A paper describes a structure:
The crystal structures of NagB2 in ligand-free or complex forms with (GlcNAc)2 (NagB2/(GlcNAc)2) and (GlcNAc)3 (NagB2/(GlcNAc)3) were determined at 1.2 to 1.8 Å resolution. There were two polypeptide chains in the asymmetric unit of the crystal of the ligand-free form (chain A, Asp47–Leu452 and chain B, Val49–Gly450), whereas there was only one polypeptide chain in the ligand-bound form. In contrast, in the asymmetric unit of the ligand-free crystal of NagB2, the two polypeptide chains showed two different opening structures. The inter-domain rotation angle between the two chains was 27.1° and belonged to an open form (chain A) and a semi-closed form (chain B). When (GlcNAc)2 was bound, this angle changed to 56.8° between the closed and open forms and 30.2° between the closed and semi-closed forms. When (GlcNAc)3 was bound, the angles were 58.6° between the closed and open forms and 32.1° between the closed and semi-closed forms. Upon binding to the ligand, SBP undergoes a conformational change from an open conformation to a closed conformation. This change is known as the “Venus flytrap” mechanism. The structure of NagB2 also changed significantly upon ligand binding, and the rotation angle was comparable to that of previously known structures.
Author numbering: 47 to 452
Write the structure that this text describes.
Amino acid sequence: DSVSLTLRHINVRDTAKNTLALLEKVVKKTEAEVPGATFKLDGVEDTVNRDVKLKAEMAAGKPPQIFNLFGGADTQNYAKAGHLLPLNDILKELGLEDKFFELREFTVDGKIYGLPEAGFVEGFYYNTKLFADAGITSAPKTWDEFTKALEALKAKNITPIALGGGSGDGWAINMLANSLFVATAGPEAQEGFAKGTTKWTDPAVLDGFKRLKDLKDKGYIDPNVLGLKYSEGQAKFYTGQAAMLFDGSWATSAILDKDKSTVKDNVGYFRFPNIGGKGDNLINGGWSNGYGFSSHLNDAEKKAVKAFIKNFYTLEIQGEALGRDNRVPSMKGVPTPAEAAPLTKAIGEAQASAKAAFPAFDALVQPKVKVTLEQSVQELLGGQLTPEKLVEKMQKVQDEANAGKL
């Protein structure tokens, strides 16, 4: 039987034309395989869709059948209102329930209400030529290999780690801290902060901040860290003046910039190295944008939605977006097409080989906690706050935030 579905998407600018062509290819395949089902693509600017169009359709109880959806508050509100299709059974039928890095941003009371299309990871960009100058012939696999790479770089008077964390950019220090204390304490520590089951003051979390301070005190983190903006820290790396940079994968376009980058012919990438505890082989990431589906569906619409999901959420489709546009997969194990750029392949392998991902701590704690950590790590690197006093300050605001509801 005939069924028409509107597919609200955000791939409207010319820079998104290959992602749109990817979507259209998936649609055509789905329409061949489910005769009678047709998809009317409705491209709308991302912020217009989020803040205006989808929001009003949801208030009216009439979303399109398929729509670009953000995780977090948006998905929480629309699921609560009953307008999002629960996806648990479809994922199980398609064998997809364990194939994504992280669905928590689309999960409400155990039920999955959306599927991220792409996201970000964090890791070390590094300069292969500066590494070779210091005798480092491969990326550090482990923390001990990481510290001796740092020692070798310092001995050659090469700034080891670029970082711009001054003024209002404490969040950039928190990227590195984030992953250091997940490496020292494991991912479960930060999951429990907002629940009261774990604490910022736990010794393995404290250890991460002690290691962070030691990187700064030994000159491995750029001594000028607190006098540099985030973008200037990126600049320190990509103009060739630091051996590595911990940053999110959104920074690839800056690292490969046609006008500003001098390292784009000799840049590599590696995950945060293994310390040997509960955080080995994990990669930090976030996946907050993808497709949600209307709950207000007849049987024909439910069949076409499942068929679209089956054809869209595949390793091949994920891999095409990665290779062409440096769109970081939401799905695990995605291979990079051989035609991709070397840095794209480097990030893809670091992500694809990861055992699992963990969220940014700020996806797990209250805004006030996030703001406090940003100020605190600046004072930590600045020698004005000890690691012990940082974690007590953090748990004090964490306790107050948790009492905010309960």
